[PDB]
Amino acid sequence: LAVQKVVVHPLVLLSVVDHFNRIGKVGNQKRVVGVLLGSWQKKVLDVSNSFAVPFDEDDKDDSVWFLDHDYLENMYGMFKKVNARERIVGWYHTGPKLHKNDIAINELMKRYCPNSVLVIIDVKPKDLGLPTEAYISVEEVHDDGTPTSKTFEHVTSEIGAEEAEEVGVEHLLRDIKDTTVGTLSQRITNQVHGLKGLNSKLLDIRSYLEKVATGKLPINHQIIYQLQDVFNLLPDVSLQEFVKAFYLKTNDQMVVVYLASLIRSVVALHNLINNKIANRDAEKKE
């Protein structure tokens, strides 16, 4: 598509959290909506700033909602005066999931940026996923004969920081972040987190299938198509060729691990030699 990856800077996250908190101080709200400013680098979005805009909606009806687009334009001008290279690239809202009226809001935003990106930023501290979920509006051409509609195609979202922004984040995360853990422990923790995320995704798919089976949701006929491919992609690890290749590869890596460990042991013995010699010299001169 027109968007390959959306990089959301920590300043955007902090601004969104602050906007949500200051609006929610009123004690009666569900979500807040603002505008996202960034630059364009190849096909990778670089969402780097944001500003709040007045917004309200009805709890029952989805067609009733007000967004101050004049406020949008005025603050776009004010921000453009400060930073001309940051242009409107989309919008954000803090609702935990999508809304039925999100397509209308994206249509409103598309005038200012034709390829607008909606970045749902969950203020609640989710334990596994990233707080950002990026979507772009696409015209879904169905093959069932149903008329073409506008949907939100998901986009891989990442959190990246500028050099000074990273410096500030590390200053704010100085105490909390533990960097003493070695690289190997970090990779193993990454594997654990990947297992947890895969379990969560599979549980979401299972819950959707459970709802479909009991009739809570209709058969999409497109999620089923994707799920058949997913189950077909499950490799057979019991094949003789695969097992032999896996064993050969594991032995090829284990011989390297053995060589590295042997060299490490010899170097450790050399260190012990140096320590003992230094201790004996220190006690001999004293």
Taking CB under 8 A as the binding criterion, the range among 59-67, 103-111, 143-151, 176-184 that sits at the site for another protein is: 176-184
Which contiguous run of DSSP H or E holds residue 12? helix 10-24
Q: Which of 162, 205, 208, 227 touches another protein by CB under 8 A?
A: 162
Instruction: Find all residues with CB under 8 Å of 41, minimum gap 6, and list them.
Output: none
Nearer residue to another protein within complex by CB, 126 or 221: 126
| Site membership for another protein, residue 4 (CB under 8 A) | no
Binding mask 203-222 for another protein (x = CB under 8 A): --------------------
Q: Smallest distance from the beta carbon of 35 to another protein, in angstroms?
A: 11
For residue 46, report the phi and psi dihedrals to the nearest 5 degrees. Answer: -135, 50
| Site membership for another protein, residue 41 (CB under 8 A) | no
CA distance 67 to 113: 16
| Site membership for another protein, residue 14 (CB under 8 A) | yes
Q: Smallest distance from the beta carbon of 208 to another protein, in angstroms?
A: 19
Instruction: Go through the chain and tell me how many residues it has.
Output: 286
Size of the site for another protein (CB under 8 A): 83
Nearer residue to another protein within complex by CB, 97 or 177: 177
CA distance 128 to 106: 27
| Site membership for another protein, residue 196 (CB under 8 A) | yes
Nearer residue to another protein within complex by CB, 41 or 253: 253
Q: In the window 71-110, what residues touch another protein (CB under 8 A)?
A: 71, 74-75, 78, 81-83
Q: Which of 235, 241, 285, 286 touches another protein by CB under 8 A?
A: 235
Binding mask 111-150 for another protein (x = CB under 8 A): ------------x-x--x-xx-------------------
CA distance 195 to 233: 18
Q: Which of 4, 228, 253, 279 touches another protein by CB under 8 A?
A: 253
CA distance 250 to 261: 16
For residue 88, report the phi and psi dihedrals to the nearest 5 degrees. Answer: -60, 125
Taking CB under 8 A as the binding criterion, the range among 109-117, 143-151, 204-212, 230-238 that sits at the site for another protein is: 230-238
Sheet with strand 157-159: strands edge to edge: 149-155, 132-140, 117-121, 87-93, 33-41, 44-52, 5-8, 157-159
CA distance 223 to 204: 12
Q: Which of 64, 138, 181, 192 touches another protein by CB under 8 A?
A: 192
Q: How many Cβ atoms are within 10 Å of 195's Cβ, its own excluded? A: 10
The dihedral through the CA atoms of 105, 109, 111, 113 has a sign that is negative
